[PDB]
């Protein structure tokens, strides 16, 4: 069982998200300090295009996927499902703009 985090694009097991949170998105989703609700809405088990990144800084792939500022690991090219409007508004309150990785927005 593995899920792909909608916001940052990392892929980790769902129990890892429940116990430890997303290591990158914890600063704005508080996933480590949240219930299965936020895990289910901000991470999706249906994805495609597994990506492993070793060096975020110099990888053009990381820049193209906007993951060069995140922890190395498993990443997904496309994630089914989008973030809800309230979470988008909360991110806009923090000043961070959310660009969907579902592919439908370009």
């Amino acid at each position: 069982r593995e899920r792909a985090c909608m916001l940052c694009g990392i892929v980790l097991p769902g129990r890892v998200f429940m116990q430890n949170g997303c290591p990158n998105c914890d600063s704005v989703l508080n996933l480590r300090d949240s219930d299965q609700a936020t895990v289910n809405e901000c991470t999706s088990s249906s994805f495609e295009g597994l990506v492993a990144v070793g060096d975020n800084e110099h990888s053009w792939v990381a820049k193209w996927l906007r993951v060069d500022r995140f922890q190395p690991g498993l990443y997904a090219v496309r994630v089914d499902g989008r973030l809800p409007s309230d979470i988008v508004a909360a991110l806009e309150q923090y000043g961070v703009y959310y660009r969907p990785r579902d592919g439908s927005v370009i």
Binding site: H58, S59, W60, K63, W64, I106
Partner: peptide
């Protein structure tokens, strides 16, 4: 942006 992230010659192969 998204358009600026296009690949150049000096990018890794």
């Amino acid at each position: 942006p998204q358009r600026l992230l296009i690949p150049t010659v000096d990018d890794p192969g």
